[PDB]
Every structure is written in C-alpha cells, then in structure tokens.
C-alpha cells in the first residue's frame, strides 16, 4: 500500500481491486501530508488526514472529477480554518475564517487569472476589496449589498459596482460645476460600455469586457461617430488619463 488520475487544484489521487468489507480505497498527497480515505465508485471521488500541528485536513472530491473542496479544521474537527474550493476551469475560491466562524478573507481566482482579493472583513460585512487585472490593480471597498471599485482622477470618481448577483454596473460622478468641463456618463448593461459625455458631446467609450479587461475607444471631434480601434488598458494610469 499503495502502488499497484489527475485532479483539479494541482492534486493527484490513486486501488483497483475492491477493499475488504467495504468500498473503494484511495490515497492522495497534498502539501507533503499523506491523506487516505475510502469512496464508493472507482473514479477517485473524501480524503481525511491529520496535521503535524494537530489540525484536521479533509479533501472532498466531486463525483464527476470536476471540483475539489480542501478544508482545514481547528483540531476539534468542527471549527473552520481554511476552505479552498478549486474547480476544473482553474476557478479556485479560497476562504479563511476568523476565530468566531465568519469569513475574513475571500480570494476569488477566475479562469483567466484575474483575481478578486477581499481582505479584513468586519462583522457587519465591510471589507477592503480589490481586483487584480492583467497589468493593473483596482481597489475599493465591500458592502453587504455589492462590491464597489473606485478610480479617482481629480474631481471625477469612477465607480465599478459588482452586484452580489454578479451584475457589473458602472457609474461616474463629477464634482465639476461648469457644464463646459463637467463630465457625465451613461451605462448600457447590454453592450457593457460606459459612454462619457462632456459639454453635451460624447468623448470616449469605455468597454468592460467579459474576459475581465477594459478597452477604451475615442469619439470624433464632433461626437458623431467612433474613431480608431479599441485600446485595451494595461496600466492604472491609463484609466485615469481617460477621466
């Protein structure tokens, strides 16, 4: 035992002949800690195991080999420490839990690498949220209702609202007074584009892509039609330069 199938979360699991007095047995090594368990089918679907620090580790593999659930407990087997739920599309979701049972950190790694880092979650649901894009990092706060990301450029403050249902809404607010230099913006849920208007004239279109990027496109000098192509933004000082 045990030597004579790939798994998500860069983990590996192993027994063909049925175990005695029961259902299939399997072993898996995770973070230099040997986990052994018994399942029913012969696919590789729980893995318990104790830590050197006397904590308890439990690895739950889905019945269709598309999702793992790595959990860590507080040596009583019942109090949570860290639950990492990885998926088949690299879409992992790590969580850490405070000493009272709520969630303190929540790192939502997408399938493309654009993470969503939540830090320091208070009891009422407030936290310091930030989105890690390809080349730049947005920051913001977290409310119970939604996740709001803010980008400021002088008087213009651009808000990116991530509703808890997942919908991405974007709003712009300008504290400028003169209608000649004041910047208003409209938002279309369908196109997912934010059209900015200054002095009753469209200036640029801001497309928040589905693959977590932000592409800018400029209007002409008469605000009539779009010009050039869509330039994907790669640094934070490029979103500010647009505002």
């Amino acid at each position: 035992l045990d030597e004579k199938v790939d798994l998500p979360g860069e983990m590996k699991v192993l027994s063909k002949e049925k175990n005695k007095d029961g259902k299939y047995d399997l072993i898996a090594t995770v973070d230099k800690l040997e986990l052994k368990g018994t399942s029913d089918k012969n696919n590789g679907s729980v893995l318990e195991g104790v830590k050197a620090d006397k904590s308890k580790v439990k690895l739950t593999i889905s019945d269709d080999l598309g999702q793992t659930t790595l959990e860590v407990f507080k040596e009583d087997g019942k109090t949570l420490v860290s639950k990492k739920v990885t998926s088949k599309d690299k879409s992992s979701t790590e969580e850490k839990f405070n000493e009272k049972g709520e969630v303190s950190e929540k790192i939502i790694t997408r399938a493309d690498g654009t993470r969503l880092e939540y830090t320091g979650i208070k009891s009422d649901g407030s936290g310091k949220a930030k989105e890690v894009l390809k080349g730049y990092v947005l920051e913001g706060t977290l409310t119970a209702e939604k996740t709001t990301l803010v980008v400021k450029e002088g008087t213009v403050t651009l808000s990116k609202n991530i509703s808890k249902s997942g919908e991405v809404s974007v709003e712009l607010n300008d504290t400028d007074s003169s209608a000649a230099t004041k910047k208003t913006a409209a938002w279309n849920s369908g196109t997912s584009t934010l059209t900015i208007t200054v002095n009753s004239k469209k200036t640029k279109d801001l497309v928040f892509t589905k693959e977590n990027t932000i592409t800018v496109q400029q209007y002409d000098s008469n605000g009539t039609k779009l010009e050039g192509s869509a330039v994907e933004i790669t640094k934070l000082d490029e979103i500010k330069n647009a505002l």
């Epitope: 729980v46 019942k78 109090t79 949570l80 000493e99 009272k100 049972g101 709520e102 969630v103 009891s123």
Partner: antibody, heavy 121, light 108 residues
C-alpha cells in the same frame, strides 16, 4: 469534558420578569458561540438567539427580536436568557447551546440539560 | 424563511434493520445541514454536521448524505438504544430552522 449547566426549573406569573442562566465548563468560553433554543410542548425546536463572548455580538431570531435579551458575563463563564414581562405563551423548555459557526450561521454541537419554564398563575 | 419538512413522522423497525430519514427543504443548498437525536427525557445530541460528517463519540453505524433539496440520515444496524426523535436543521439562510421531528420505534 465540555459541560453546560443550566438554572433550575422555575415558576412565574404573567407579567413577572425572569432571568435564567447557563454555566459553562470544559472549553475556552470566549471563543465559541452560545445561544438559546426553545422547544414548545407538543411543538418542536425553535431558535431564539446566540451570542459570542466577549465581543458580545448578540444575534436574535426575528420571531424573538425585541421579545427577549441574551447576555454573557465572560468572567464567570455564564450566559443568560432574560425577559421583561412573561406571557403564558412562553411556557416551554429552554436549552443553552454551544454552536460552531458556518458562514453567518451555526450548528449546535453541545446542549444543556434544559430549563423548564412554567408560566401560570 | 426556509421551511424544513421531515418524513416519515413515525417509523417502526426491528433490531439489525437499516432505516433512513429524509429532510425535505423549502429551498436548495449543499452541506449545510445537521442531525440531532433527542432520546426521551434527555436533550438533543449532535449526530452529524455538514450533512455528511459524523462526530466522534457517536457510533460508526450513523451516516448522512444528500444535496440540493433532499438530505438523508441513515442507521446501519439499528439498536434498541436508538429509540428517539430525530431532527434536521439548516444553517444556510438565517434564522436557523428545524424539522418537525421523526420518531423511531423498535419492533420487539
């Protein structure tokens, strides 16, 4: 090891205050939740609230919000359930419970032996 | 709120049998259920947490499984000491809610 000793049974009259206690031994009192569960005779289990010492983050049930108070005195490992004026409808059994927290919620791993409140004149 | 309906209500079986209690949920979740046992005269004891995880101190003949809407508590080889009323409880949507109970009777 982990034990939860409750106040003895009581008798009240409609309109009287009442405070019943639960005395905790066997675990680190100030890092596990503590709550109160009702069980009406005939009916089943009804949840009232839960508190975490020593943050004293008290959290109630809508069916009991404003109708009850839940406190903890972390110097004596003692939790309390408290009324202002009792109605005969509150005649039930009350368990103090220790709870393990999942996301914003709990399941109750240890149970006190219960306190039979009887409210009749 | 989330209603939780247990079934069956009463249940007879003999020693050595294999009984299953179900917990039908008004809403859908996963691994957010608990199972309790209230023997006559005593208080509920925690049998199973997270809808599948058995707590040390209760015999290995107890098991729980399920997802979505239907969960199940199962006894492997029923014993006379198992005469009690069984409740399920969810901790997904607060407030907490319990089931109406499921009495378990031993045919002698």
């Amino acid at each position: 090891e982990v034990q939860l000793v409750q106040s003895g049974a009581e008798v009240k009259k409609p309109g009287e205050s009442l405070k019943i206690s639960c005395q905790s031994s066997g675990y680190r009192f100030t890092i596990y939740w503590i709550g109160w569960v009702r069980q009406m005779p005939g009916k089943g289990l009804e949840w009232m609230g839960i508190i975490w010492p020593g943050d004293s983050d008290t959290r109630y049930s809508p069916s009991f919000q404003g109708q009850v108070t839940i406190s903890a005195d972390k110097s004596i490992s003692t939790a309390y359930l408290q009324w202002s004026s009792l109605k005969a409808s509150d005649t039930a059994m009350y368990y103090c419970v220790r709870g393990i927290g999942r996301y914003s919620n709990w399941f109750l791993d240890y149970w006190g032996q219960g306190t039979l409140v009887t409210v009749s004149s | 709120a989330i209603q939780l309906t247990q079934s069956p209500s009463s249940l007879s079986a003999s020693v050595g049998d294999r009984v299953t209690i179900t917990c039908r949920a008004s809403q859908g979740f996963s691994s957010a259920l608990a199972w309790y046992q209230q023997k006559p005269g005593k208080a509920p004891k925690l049998l199973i947490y997270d809808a599948s995880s058995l707590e040390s101190g209760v015999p290995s003949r107890f098991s729980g499984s399920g997802s979505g809407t239907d969960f199940t508590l199962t006894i492997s080889s029923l014993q006379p000491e198992d005469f009690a009323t069984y409740y399920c409880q969810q901790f997904n949507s607060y407030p907490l809610t319990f089931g109406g109970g499921t009495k378990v009777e031993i045919k002698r």
